[PDB]
Amino acid sequence: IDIEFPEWFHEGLSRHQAENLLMGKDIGFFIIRASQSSPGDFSISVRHEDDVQHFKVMRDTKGNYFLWTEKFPSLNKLVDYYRTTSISKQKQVFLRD
Amino acid sequence: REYVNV
Numbered sequence: 001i002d003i004e005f006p007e008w009f010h011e012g013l014s015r016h017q018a019e020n021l022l023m024g025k026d027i028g029f030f031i032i033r034a035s036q037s038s039p040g041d042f043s044i045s046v047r048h049e050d051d052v053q054h055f056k057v058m059r060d061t062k063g064n065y066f067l068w069t070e071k072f073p074s075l076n077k078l079v080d081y082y083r084t085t086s087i088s089k090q091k092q093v094f095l096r097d
Numbered sequence: 098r099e100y101v102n103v
Contacts, residue, residue: 015098037098056100067102088101 006076008032008097018045019052028096032057032075042075049095055087 007009012023013033022029025047035041035056042057044067055067057075064071065078067087072078082095 043100054098054100055102058102 005058006032006079013045015043015054018054022047022052026096028094030079030095031095032079039042044087046087046093046095048088048091053088 008030009032010018011034013031015036018031018033019069021031027047027049030044030046032042032044035043038056040049044057045052045057060066060067060071064073065075066072067078067082068090069090070081070085072081079095080096084094086092087095
């Protein structure tokens, strides 16, 4: 099998710990963590210019993953799309490593 | 809690 989660996947990081980690980084650095306020969701924490913002990973009954309109077969394909299409609709923010 | 896309 594959076992190992992707490098940016940190199941047990709280929203606050994700903020503290990402405030040290540039725009677009990000992590994926299991959700706190909704057990059973995942969240994506992303450095913006002045703070860290959070996105809810959406799903449908076919198992697709999405944030907005475009849908993906996997979390990895979602993350990949947001490297070159802005994950923010108010400012331009691209996921980066 | 708030999320951008919710």
